[PDB]
Amino acid sequence: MFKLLLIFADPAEAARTLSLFPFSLNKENFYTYHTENVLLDVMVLKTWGYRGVVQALSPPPSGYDLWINAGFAGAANPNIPLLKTYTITSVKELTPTTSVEEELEVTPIPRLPLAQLTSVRSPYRDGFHEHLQLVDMEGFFIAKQASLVACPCSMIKVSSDYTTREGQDFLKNNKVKLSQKLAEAIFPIYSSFID
Amino acid sequence: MFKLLLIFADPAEAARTLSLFPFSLNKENFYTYHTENVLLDVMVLKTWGYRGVVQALSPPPSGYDLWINAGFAGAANPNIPLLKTYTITSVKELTEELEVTPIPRLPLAQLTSVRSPYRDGFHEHLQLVDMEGFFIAKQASLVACPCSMIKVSSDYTTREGQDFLKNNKVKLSQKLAEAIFPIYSSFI
């Protein structure tokens, strides 16, 4: 039996994937679906409050065969079109006040185009940057937690906004379309693990 | 049972973390708490700096799965805000370098340990400055134990910068406690 964990940072990212299968809420307060040889679980990091907390994935869930982090990401290079779904090759965490970084490779999803991801705590609105591609908040955290249980981790990120103040309106107004892109990318992965 | 050792350089730094759990006092400056899954011990140094590290951690304690050194640190760069909790990626001695294991979901910084106080202003090469971290990481390596550090920015390294630390001791100690509590729960 193949056990797949999907991790979304927030409910808007998760919404359309949760509509794809007849999930039920279990007694542990997260979503679960199974059929044939596949268990499909969904966890959403930030349902409450102004920020996610480390205890969203600490201790990390054990027992899965693959984690997929699917979410929205800002585009910090204008040659990235919006509403495009990428898989991530490596994810960096950046601390702007010190410029210290950490970086981890992640497992690319077949037949999605490749991109690099940087995770930063604050929403990114400075502008465009030569050396950044996609920008999110939670990707690095999730990949590092996956390493603690030696579970492979893959990422799907859809370009959701350009990283400017004015660019944030697009994200605000297109959350359903963006969530739908994530759902459309997850389904063929789920389908390929049916034995 | 996971076994966690926390090391603080003085009581003020330790104070709010000690309030998080109903610790027992094993002996002077050595507190212990356990559940079925986790042993949490806290050692507070009897004096600051490398002398206090040698006194407390030579021989280094064996048997732990992780050491965490939590403390106040000076900011040697004005781009570092005060009252901010960092985890350390590497530590060097000012007057030799060691990798340190970052705690998840904390901003990242590099640490420089000095053997005498550092009111020597801003050096564009330095980030956070303390007196104990390098020596603690060195003792952890003797027992092949991972070491992590939590350092909250407590002062700038300019003249009279300790006034900010002195005025904010409780808030700074509470910041350390709030960063430590979830580490404990990461092992339940």
Of the CA atoms within 13 Å of residue A182, those in its CB half-sphere come to 31
B93, burial (CB in 10 Å: exposed 0-12, middle 13-18, buried 19+):
middle
d(CA A166, CA A153): 33
CB contact under 8 A, B108 and A121: no
d(CA B101, CA B35): 25
CB contact under 8 A, B80 and A98: yes
d(CA A37, CA A31): 18
CB contact under 8 A, A55 and B185: yes
User: Which residues of chain B neighbour A58 with C-beta distances below 8 Å?
Assistant: 104, 182, 185-186
A92 touches chain B (CB under 8 A): no
d(CA B130, CA A3): 46
CB contact under 8 A, B182 and A97: no
Structural method: X-ray
- Can you give the length of chain A in residues? 195
d(CA B124, CA B56): 33
User: Which residues of chain A neighbour B109 with C-beta distances below 8 Å?
Assistant: 95, 98, 100
Domain of residue A63 covers 1-195
Q: Which helix (DSSP H) or strand (DSSP E) does residue B35 occupy?
A: none
- Cα of B56 to nearest chain A Cα, Å: 31
- CA dist A165 to A12, A127, A168, A171, B106, Å? 20, 8, 6, 11, 26
A positions 134-163 inside 8 Å of B (CB): 141, 144-145
User: Which residues of chain B neighbour A59 with C-beta distances below 8 Å?
Assistant: 185-188
B41: number of Cβ within 10 Å: 20
d(CA B3, CA B40): 6
**Tokens 């030579």 belong to which residue?**
B58
Listed residue (A63, A61, A66) closest to A87, CA to CA: A66
Q: In chain B, which ranges are E strands?
A: 2-8, 24-27, 30-34, 38-44, 66-75, 85-93, 97-99, 108-113, 128-130, 147-156
A110, A112, A113, A118 alpha-carbon torsion, rounded to 10° = -90
Strands B2-8 and B66-75, sheet pairing: parallel
Q: In A15-65, which ranges are E strands?
A: 24-25, 31-35, 38-44
CB contact under 8 A, A145 and B104: yes
Listed residue (A192, A143, A104) closest to A7, CA to CA: A143
- CA dist A131 to A76, A92, A110, B69, Å? 9, 12, 25, 34
Listed residue (B111, B152, B148) closest to B128, CA to CA: B111
Look up the CATH number of the domain holding residue A127: 3.40.50.1580
Total domain count, chain A: 1
- Write out the DSSP string of A164-185: STTTHHHHHH-HHHHHHHHHHH
Residue pair A108/A183 in contact (Cβ under 8 Å)? The answer is no
